[PDB]
C-alpha cells in the first residue's frame, strides 16, 4: 500500500503547525551527508519482483 498522504502527527498539546521546537517535531529533516563519509552507510539498490 502506498503512503503518499503526509500530515503532521499530533499526540501532545501542540499541533505542530509550523511551530517546530519546544517539544515539537517535524518528521522530514535534512541529513547533511557530505561525500567523504562512511560509504558502508551508503544506500543500496533494492528491487522487488513480485
Partner 1 sequence: SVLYNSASFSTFKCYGVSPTKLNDLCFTNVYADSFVIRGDEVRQIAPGQ
Contact residues toward partner 1 (CB under 8 A) are 11, 13, 23
State which residue, 34 or 50, has the beta carbon closest to partner 1: 34
Determine the Cα–Cα distance for residues 12 and 9; give it in Å rounded to an integer: 9
Q: Return the C-alpha cell found at 15.
A: 499541533
- Could you tell me how far CA 34 lies from the centroid of its own chain? 18
State which residue, 22 or 44, has the beta carbon closest to partner 1: 22
* Minimum CB distance to partner 1, residue 18 (Å): 20
* Minimum CB distance to partner 1, residue 19 (Å): 15
Amino acid at each position: 500500500e502506498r503512503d503518499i498522504s503526509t500530515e503532521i502527527y499530533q499526540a501532545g498539546s501542540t499541533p505542530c503547525n509550523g511551530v517546530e521546537g519546544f517539544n515539537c517535531y517535524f518528521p522530514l529533516q535534512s541529513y547533511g551527508f557530505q561525500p567523504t563519509y562512511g560509504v558502508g552507510y551508503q544506500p543500496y539498490r533494492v528491487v522487488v519482483l513480485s
